[PDB]
């Protein structure tokens, strides 16, 4: 329920800042120790899903509320996404999942459970179909 809540005491602010520092440095260095191939894929995914997230903003929130009001776990979700992937072979459904997962992430504050989800779901999302789409662009 919101963000300002967990930031109760002074310690919590400093502890958050330190934790944010570590995560941002690990991430920036990571980008730098990446091949230009990966780097370009990152560019492709970045504009597509930054667009999807922006164009279908309210559909993201709509799906967020659909996920809330029901007792729903990360795992059953991944499985559903996987079943979808087996028949829907469009690019759209994959991009939309990435953006929806990204929305789920922005709202969770546990970094550990969040990265687990990112990790599990990105496996599922990157089936052979999706990979073929990404490699064949610029």
């Amino acid at each position: 329920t919101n963000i300002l809540d967990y930031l109760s005491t002074e310690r919590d602010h400093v502890m958050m800042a330190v934790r944010y520092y570590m995560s941002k440095q690990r991430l920036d260095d990571l980008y730098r120790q990446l091949p230009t191939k990966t780097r370009s894929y990152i560019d492709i995914i970045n504009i597509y899903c930054d667009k999807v997230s922006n164009d279908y903003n309210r559909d993201m929130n709509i799906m967020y509320d659909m996920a809330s009001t029901k007792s729903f776990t990360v795992y059953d979700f991944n499985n559903e996404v996987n079943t979808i992937m087996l028949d829907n072979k469009g690019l759209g459904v994959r991009l939309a999942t990435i953006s929806f997962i990204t929305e789920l992430g922005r709202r969770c504050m546990n970094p550990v459970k969040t990265i687990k989800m990112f990790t599990l779901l990105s496996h599922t999302i990157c089936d052979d179909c999706f990979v073929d789409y990404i490699t064949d662009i610029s």
Binding site: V52, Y56, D59, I62, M63, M66, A67, K70, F72, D76, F77, E80, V81, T83, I84, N88, G90, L91, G92, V93, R94, L95, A96, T97, F100
Partner: peptide, 23 residues
């Protein structure tokens, strides 16, 4: 149950498809 979110996601995806296999 859960495929309500599933359907929604595919629907969005179909819109995304029709919008880049044209102008």
């Amino acid at each position: 149950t859960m495929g309500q979110v599933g359907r929604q996601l595919k629907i969005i995806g179909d819109d995304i498809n029709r919008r880049y296999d044209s102008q």
